[model samples]
Target chain A: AGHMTSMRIPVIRSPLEIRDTERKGRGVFALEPIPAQTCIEISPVLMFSKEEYEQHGQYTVLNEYTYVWSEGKQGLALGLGSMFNHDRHPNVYWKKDNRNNYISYYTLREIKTNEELCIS
Target chain B: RIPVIRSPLEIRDTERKGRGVFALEPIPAQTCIEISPVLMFSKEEYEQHGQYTVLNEYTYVWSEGKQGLALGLGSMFNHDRHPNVYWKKDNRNNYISYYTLREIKTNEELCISYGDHLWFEDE
Candidate 1:
């Protein structure tokens, strides 16, 4: 009789994000091996004052793309952490914040060893 | 399930955009790091959620900032003309633009052009 049994792999968690080597900015990193469909870290809900964000726009390019479409403060979908730089063929992804609104990058692809990750 | 991300002070640097999540294993293509339903916050709710009393430096731009969860992954992304992720239809519209996103590989991070049109009116 031949005995064959598959080994159960332990689950690996992603690490907390931090500043990156490049000036592009800070982000998260990979500590081990994660298979496809794994959930990276979820971004915390970003809360800001309508006035403060408006002021921030004066100095940053981030303002060009975002705006206040409603009577209330504007909301953006956030996801696709650090491995978040430019990519030609990307694997990580995002979904809409709602039935009709901004897309949230709740999920992202894993970075390979020694691979410098950046957001697009 | 995607939820709000939280971290220690070490990662919180608005200038650096608060980088911190890391993968313990090798995630293949088409992985979901986070997924959260959008929750609208009144101007007041937004202020109290993070920390109303402290009013730190990060809260500076927040006065004009919007009040919604980022799902939190966006901070990881950098700005680009042609981004990995973006909105469809038209940025001119006032409501949600029916923009849908695709799942990316485990090796790829998601991003988008902030104001670019995600899709055309005709499919």
Candidate 2:
């Protein structure tokens, strides 16, 4: 067993928060004004093999949370990656880096404070 | 700008634990393994909706009587009676960070304590 100790860890701070919406259950919002093309989130993914996923994962709630990965695998974004809501014309866009096994989300336009960040 | 570093970590299925985090390589003690941003919910909202759903299993206590759902590997770490990892809450930044409590060998599973009261029986 390990006791708690003071240590410096890697932290990527962003001016974002989560709030409930009348239409959307939960969504990502900007706490402050965000410039266009800013990188807001970089989420590492949890990978699941195709066989493992078909045999077990797809039956779980992960079917709704996973992204298509290379080689028929599925990826579940960690961090704020899984929290963003969707819109046909979104203010945010995401890129999946298969080599690194992570996803990054960027602003498609200047976001006003308290506005929701959505992706297509 | 902060760089996105890839941690030498992976996830594997346990017979009893479902999914758990594992080391791809030897990790030294005091190493920072993960920094997961959190999604916050008000006490009222959490008690009203979150407690009845799967969110109850993952939410952490945040300040002002709020609940936090860790976004990254933060939510994936399983509990153990004797854990090799420790976690800390960063309210100022609204994220939780994980650190290695001691040297962890390759393929070793990383675990943390979920406090004295656990919903599941310890293996």
Candidate 3:
């Protein structure tokens, strides 16, 4: 049902902030300048099997927030991972760490202060 | 510098309880579990907008009446009176760290105390 490994803590501290958007419901924004390729977030995910998701999860508001996970499963990002909005030209990129059951988000280019972080 | 560590933690659906964190392997006592970043809202902002939204369920107490929402597993851990985990807030760093209060067995569910207020029926 889960992976095996030793206990360890996942720490995060960033210059990111969440603010209300006019078109988007909520969005992640930078409070300070950040270099390109900077890792901004590493969010642990709550995964659901296809069966569980179809029966219960998809019916709830979670359907709007979950990501397409491996093996046809669904993953609900626990941290700020769920807060980032979508864009055609995104300033951020993310990767799924299937072994660790988390996602790491990185900046695509040097970001200025107050710019919103988005993903496609 | 930020350090990222790995754990054998997973999420699962529980009976009555929706989803909870569980140890995929045995965890020794005093081990740090998670350090979740927080999003802070000023007192005026929280009172005016944050409280009226779903944030009311996930926000944590912060300095000067401000509210904070933990960005990692901080908001995901369920509540228990006899908790196996305890948490500490780093106000300066704006993160909350969780640690095991006792040795945790494999597949054991991790829980923390959410104060005396009982928002849901205790199992």
Which candidate do you rate higher for TM-score, 1 or 3?
3
Best by lDDT: 3
Q: Comparing to the true complex, what docking class would candidate 2 get?
A: incorrect
Per-model TM-score versus the true fold:
0.33, 0.55, 0.57
In order of DockQ, best first, we have: 3, 2, 1
Colliding residue pairs in candidate 3: A79-B71
Any idea what lDDT model 1 has?
A: 0.35
lDDT score of residue B29 within candidate 2: 98
Best-performing candidate as measured by DockQ: 3
Error of 3 at B22 (Å): 14
| Model 3 docking grade | incorrect
lDDT of 3 at A10: 36
Off by over 4 Å in 3: A1-4, B1-71, B76-111, B114-123
Error of 2 at B36 (Å): 6.7
iRMS values in order, in angstroms?
16.6, 11.6, 10.3
Q: What is the TM-score of chain B alone in each candidate?
A: 0.31, 0.86, 0.85
